[PDB]
Structure 1
Amino acid sequence: MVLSEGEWQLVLHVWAKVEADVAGHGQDILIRLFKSHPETLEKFDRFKHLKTEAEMKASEDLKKVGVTVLTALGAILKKKGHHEAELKPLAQSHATKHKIPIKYLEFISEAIIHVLHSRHPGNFGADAQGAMNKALELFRKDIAAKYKELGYQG
């Protein structure tokens, strides 16, 4: 697929607001994912044991990981579709080391869109959400094709 420049703009405009607080957004998103789809917490051997949301809010590890997840996503979105080189190492460790099915990437995409919608309603109207969804679908489709080359497709 291919986003228009206008769609990239809407995506990079709401992302410039996320970047004013990357650790807080990272926490919100991962907690939104784990509440919604608790099976995904099992993949994180680091803090599979956190039982409640208050425990999650207080885990410094969970917050570091969130910052690492968002910072890498943001670097991919800034490429505007030209992301081949940033995807490779990423598709390799998620497919061979962590074994993250494509479906979990769909779950975290839904968590990102939920948080942006709550935190940034003025910059995240319908067109901006549609553009973000497009940018994340593009990201999943390219990562899925890379999984397949790497022998995982999952």
Structure 2
Amino acid sequence: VLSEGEWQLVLHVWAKVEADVAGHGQDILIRLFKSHPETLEKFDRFKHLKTEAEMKASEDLKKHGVTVLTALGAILKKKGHHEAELKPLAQSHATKHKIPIKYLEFISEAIIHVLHSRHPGDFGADAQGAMNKALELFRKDIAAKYKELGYQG
């Protein structure tokens, strides 16, 4: 359960994300795709890009980073009371996209990396701990909804 002060740390660095959601989305997905190339396979509109400039140049990748961060920012704003927001994610992610929990760990790790890299002044140890807790709560709750839906994840 995060404390109120930990949610404030999470939402404080997220306001920095919100100044440029698409730029942050491209960097997060580029870090994910470079760290774990196999996740790039889920994306047919850009599964063949090979360099960072290609990926920066991709309109579909840029749109997808905004899809990811818009939904993730609405979740975090719920401060853990996110069941209604997670219900549509877990449906499509369990039945159409088939996204393993290991993949949700990989992008969490990409998210923390890009936040440290772009916002180290607003993402010190305590903020990093608070964000790691919020993403760990999101992954736990998704994982349990995937099981309800018969997807192991």
Determine helix, strand or coil for the equivalent of 2:86.
Answer: helix
SS in 2 for 1:122: helix
Task: After TM superposition, give the deviation of residue 47 of structure 1 in Å.
Answer: 1.2
Q: 1: distance between equivalents of 2:150 and 2:97?
A: 14
Tell me the alpha carbon deviations over residues 32-67 of structure 1, each in whole angstroms, 9 at most, x when there is no partner.
000000000001122111121111010011000000
Q: How far did 1:99 drift?
A: 0.4
- TM-score w.r.t. length of structure 2: 0.99
1:97 is matched with 96
- Structure 1 window deviating more from structure 2 (139-148 vs 44-53): it is 44-53
Give 1:153 shift.
Answer: 1.7
Misfit runs of 4+, over 3 Å: none
SS in 1 for 2:81: coil
Mapped to 1, the partners of 2:149 and 2:46 lie a distance apart of: 27
Q: Deviation string for 1:15-43 (max 9, x for gaps)?
A: 01110000000000000000000000001
Deviation at 1:3, TM superposition (A): 0.5
Alpha-carbon distance in structure 2 between the residues aligned to 1:125 and 1:51: 32
Which ranges in structure 1 are unaligned for 5 or more consecutive residues?
A: none
Greater mean alpha carbon deviation, residues 47-56 or residues 60-69: 47-56
Q: How far apart are residue 68 of structure 1 and its match?
A: 0.5
> How far 1:91 moved relative to its partner?
0.4
Once the 2 structures are TM-superposed, how far is the Cα of residue 8 of structure 1 from its aligned partner?
0.2
| 1:111-154 C-alpha deviation (Å, 9 max, x unpaired) | 00000000001000000000000000000000000000000021
Question: d(CA) in 2 for partners of 1:15 and 1:52?
Answer: 27
Aligned counterparts of 1:14 and 1:90: Cα–Cα separation in 2: 23
CA distance in structure 1 between the aligned counterparts of 2:152 and 2:132, rounded to whole angstroms: 21
1:73 CA drift (Å): 0.1
| Further displaced range: 28-37 or 45-54 | 45-54
Mapped to 2, the partners of 1:47 and 1:120 lie a distance apart of 28
Farther-moved stretch of structure 1 (79-88 vs 45-54): 45-54
Identity percentage of aligned residues: 99
Aligned residues: 153
